[PDB]
Structure 1
Amino acid sequence: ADVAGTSNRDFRGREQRLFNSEQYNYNNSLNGEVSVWVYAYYSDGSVLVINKNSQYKVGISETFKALKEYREGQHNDSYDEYEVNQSIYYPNGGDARKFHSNAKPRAIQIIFSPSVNVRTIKMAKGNAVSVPDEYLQRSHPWEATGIKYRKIKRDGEIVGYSHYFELPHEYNSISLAVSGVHKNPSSYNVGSAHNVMDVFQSCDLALRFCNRYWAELELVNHYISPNAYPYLDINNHSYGVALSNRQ
């Protein structure tokens, strides 16, 4: 046989490159996944991740209460935290024993898989009683925030998209939903009558994952990296795997 790495007959090299290219391209087909992650960062350095993976479109919707830190199997000041919520829903509405709950997120990062179309991304960032813009009567139910997403890149390839915003002020008390649509450069509308019931089934088939990691390092090591997920850390370093035309 030809010697490795010296000719066009290195079929192991050609198949390795095809194996990667096919994964990249499958994810972008209408048969592929589109995925979103919301990361809520807490002052103790822990991170709640919520992930949803589905065909055609995907999103996540959470209340103010649901994004607060919850330590499984530990004390959580649960009575005082009921009172904190009352005081956040209406000023002076509660009887809490603290000025600032350390369970409130200090920051949110939203990441989409590279199979999203960025122009379809929509976010409803509401106040603590789940209203998008001060009063229901004057609320558009979302903002199209695609222009703010940064490309997470590895070896020159877009491995995902990130929108990050800090919540450093006492008044940053939010509810949050986000949504994006899978790329579709074709003129076959996946929600047109021929396929609309498949998209209804996709609403039931979407898989969700939720967990609190103790540190960004642990999130990088045990969540992002093992699953070949995109990520951007506090030092602006990009994680992910480049696949298109690569061995």
Structure 2
Amino acid sequence: SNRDFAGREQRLFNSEQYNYNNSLNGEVSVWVYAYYSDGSVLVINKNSQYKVGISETFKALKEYREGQHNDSYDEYEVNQSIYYPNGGDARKFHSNAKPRAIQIIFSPSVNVRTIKMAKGNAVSVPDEYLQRSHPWEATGIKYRKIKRDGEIVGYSHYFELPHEYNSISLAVSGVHKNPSSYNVGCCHNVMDVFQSCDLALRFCNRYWAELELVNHYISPNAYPYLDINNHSYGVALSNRQ
């Protein structure tokens, strides 16, 4: 009956979480996953109000194994030969520290039409030369819905870097949904958005395998994920128990 208050309150508690995230008071979040040939994965996450993004250099996306050998001098040289052909004195043809693939994921509180990406070359130029570069591409149409139980739990853009020439710098950006006509960045709230820049929380870590990422990062935090088998992860909350 309608007197099952445990049931009604459970459904409301979940719906409230869904809706709060999607409010102007809520978070918007982005993740960059960089996939390496040894099967390890670097995640960079940022969480903020209003808008959020991530920007990394070529070098910053390369595999780094904390507290172990990293071929660091040779990898300085690898970099020199990536920035300019035959510029370096590296003892390898292909650095296994280079990302083989990238996945960008946004929380379902993003507006997909606001997503912007600057995928640069290795010296951080968006499109060959600065003089001809538009500083971003709007890539929203390329994002797939990550779905669980009918509910969009996130948005994914996945792209491989399978060729020797895919050597990139990367920045991505999205804005929190706002179906209102209230501009969060206009004069009444603009200094709150400036503060949100200071208040944004960052996380980064390298997991040894996608299994660890799924079990110990995605799942315990109720984050969205799409794995290399095209399987969706996340928690549906809208009107659900």
Q: Check whether TM > 0.5.
A: yes
CA distance in 2, matches of 1:8, 1:203: 45
1:131 deviation in Å? 0.1
CA distance in 1, matches of 2:191, 2:48: 14
How does 1:1-247 map onto structure 2 within 5 Å?
A: 7-247=1-241
1:156 deviation in Å? 0.1
CA offsets per residue over residues 94-141 of structure 1, 9 Å max, x none? Answer: 000000000000000000000000000000000000000000000000
- Runs (5+) with no aligned partner, structure 2: none
1:146 deviation in Å? 0.1
CA distance in 1, matches of 2:154, 2:76: 37
- Give 4+ residue runs of structure 1 displaced > 6 Å after superposition: none
1:50 deviation in Å? 0.1
Give secondary structure in 1 for the equivalent of 2:59.
Answer: coil
CA distance in 2, matches of 1:214, 1:34: 27
1:217 deviation in Å? 0.4
CA distance in 2, matches of 1:66, 1:234: 23
- Runs (5+) with no aligned partner, structure 1: 1-6
1:19 deviation in Å? 0.1
CA distance in 1, matches of 2:85, 2:40: 28
CA distance in 2, matches of 1:84, 1:236: 33
CA distance in 2, matches of 1:32, 1:231: 20
Give secondary structure in 2 for the equivalent of 1:65.
Answer: helix
1:86 deviation in Å? 0.1
1:230 deviation in Å? 0.1
1:71 deviation in Å? 0.1
1:148 deviation in Å? 0.1
CA distance in 2, matches of 1:16, 1:79: 56
CA distance in 1, matches of 2:215, 2:197: 30
CA distance in 1, matches of 2:90, 2:56: 23
CA offsets per residue over residues 40-75 of structure 1, 9 Å max, x none? Answer: 000000000000000000000000000000000000
CA distance in 1, matches of 2:35, 2:46: 18
* Aligned sequence identity (%): 99
The count of aligned residue pairs is 241
Give secondary structure in 2 for the equivalent of 1:22.
Answer: helix
Give secondary structure in 2 for the equivalent of 1:134.
Answer: coil
Please say which structure displays the higher CA radius of gyration.
1
Pairwise CA RMSD: 0.2
